[PDB]
Each structure stands twice: as C-alpha cells, then as structure tokens.
A = this chain, B = another copy of it.
Amino acid sequence: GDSLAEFLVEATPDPKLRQLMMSMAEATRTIAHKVRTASCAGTACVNSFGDEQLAVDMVADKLLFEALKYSHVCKLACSEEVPEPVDMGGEGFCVAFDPLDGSSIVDTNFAVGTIFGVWPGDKLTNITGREQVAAGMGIYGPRTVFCIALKDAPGCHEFLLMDDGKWMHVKETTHIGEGKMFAPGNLRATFDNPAYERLINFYLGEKYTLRYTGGMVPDVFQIIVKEKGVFTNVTSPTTKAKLRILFEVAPLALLIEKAGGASSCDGKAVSALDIPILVCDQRTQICYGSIGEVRRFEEYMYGTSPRFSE
C-alpha cells in the first residue's frame, strides 16, 4: 500500500497532528528494537537508553518522552508509571501513554505493546475519551505494528514496519461482526459476581474459542484483525479495578469503535469515550467487542442494554 506520511496528509488537515503521529511511529520503531535485543537474564528485562542500563518499561518511557519533546506540538505528557502530567515545552496536543503494556509477558516472548491517546488543548483532567483527536497502539510481536485511528478520518488503520525503516499501510478496519471468541480478563471475579459468572458460563457453553494472553494490547488488537470477539474486564466486591481510562481504556475505545465496535465502561452502560476522566490515575472496568457482543454484555451484567437492546 502507501506510506504513513502519505496516509496522514489525507486523514487530518492539521499538520501538527501529522508531525505528532510521525513522532509516535518513530518512537514505536525504536522501542521495537530495544525489546528485540533486551537481556532478560535476571527475570527483569534490561536495555540501554543512553549511558544507563534500565528496564524495558523504562527505556520505552524515556523514548516516548523524548519523541514528544522534539515534536514541538506537545503541551502535556503523562505516563502510567508517574500519573502526573508534565510540560514538554510545546503546544498543540496532550498525550497520555502506557509505555509497555505487558508486565508478565516480556520474559515469555509474548506480544506486548504501547498505548497512547492524544487530546487537544492543555488539560489531561476533566476530559472525556470522545475529545480525543487521535489514538494508537504499537504492537511488538513477530511483526511491528502501528495501529492508529484519527477522529477526522474513518476507520482503524494498521501500519507495518518495513525493512527500510518505514511504515506501510496494510489494513483498514471499518466493521467488526459476530463470532465466537472471547478474552475473559479478571476471571477471579466469577466468584463474587454472579452476573459475570453466568456470562462466562455462556461463553464456555456456546464453544467460544479462548484467546487470553494477559496483555491488553494484543487481546484487543485481535478483535480488530479478526473483526470479531469480546474482551471483558469486570470488577467485583473483592476484586478492585486496575485498568486506567486515560492511559489504556479510553484510547483503545477509540480504536475499537472507529473500527465498528462498541465499549461498556465503568459499569454505567455507556461508551468509554463518554466516561468523565477526573484524575489521571482514575481506574475503571471495560468490555470491548462487536455491537452484538456488547449488547449481550450489558444484558447479562445489568439486565438490559440501554443503547442496543430490542
């Protein structure tokens, strides 16, 4: 297909947003190289940033902050590790990111990833996921994938890192249909939550194929590629919420909904793009999937789906 710079010129009329997306794709390429040659002798995984040997989750953090600084179009930046925004000396967008989302899977050479969401303005609080101008994730697997969506452009677009160091468009997703595949996150809640239990028993009883790796990036990315599936992460009386709206859930909600899917956040039967983000470290629960499978989620968990039921 065609290149990323060529795609961006038609997706958005904002050249600042185009420079930002270019800087995120270059940082994704460098993180992909750092993970490739990471030394995990020590159960921890190390690589060198400049003159210091830290962990992969920290080399990615510093590489993403570096890319935002030198894009000159970033006002605020915030990482999941330190959930307090920081000024990057630019202006245009505010970017929040999870540097590497795969804590218990880097040593096992599983697919891991980076999540980032882009907000316009000067605030990372008192916003919603619908105010996002762009969102994306870089997936570090056998291939290196840059999966993005821009508000001013239709669909969710996947870019492949080629041998020459450039990005090439390889798939545009605009419809997520029906199928039997599920990723049950937080299954320990099938104990204090009878609605979640009955839902999981539906999946297990209808012969849904199981695909759960523990990392959110590949578990949600597979829905966009297969154009089918359900992801669920549900809280319980004894199990507390661990996903973040700013760094993880809200950006992924845009990638999923722009590809023809739906989300159900904070147990309030609305999209994750409509849940107010009051603090950066705000937690939540979520369901991702096709419209049909999200309807079933709300019917099982709440009684009815306000948006999609009959």
Contacts and interface: CB of A to CB of B under 8 A. Distances in A.
Given A1-B41, A110-B141, A111-B111, 4 more contacts: A36-B144, A108-B226, A140-B142, A187-B207
Contacts of A32: 142
Q: Report how many copies the assembly holds.
A: 2
Interface in A27-47: 32, 35-41
B214 A142 contact: no
A171 B214 contact: no
A211 B213 contact: yes
A40 B170 contact: yes
A39 B160 contact: yes
Interface of A: 1, 32, 35-41, 105-112, 139-145, 160-163, 170-171, 184, 187-188, 190-191, 204, 207, 209-214, 218, 221-222, 225-226
A190 B203 CA distance: 13
A209 B204 contact: no
The 10 A-B residue pairs whose C-beta atoms are closest, nearest first, are A109-B141, A140-B142, A35-B142, A108-B222, A108-B225, A188-B207, A109-B139, A109-B143, A41-B170, A37-B163
A184 B210 contact: yes
* Residue in A36, A143, A163, A212 whose Cβ sees the most chain B Cβ within 10 Å: A143
Contact of A170 (B39, B160, B163, B212): B39
Given A108-B225, A162-B37, A211 B214 contact: yes
A109 B144 CA distance: 8
A214 B211 CA distance: 7
A204 B184 CA distance: 12
9 contacts: A32-B142, A37-B163, A108-B222, A109-B142, A109-B221, A110-B213, A110-B222, A140-B142, A212-B212
A45 B184 CA distance: 28
Contacts of A204: 187, 190
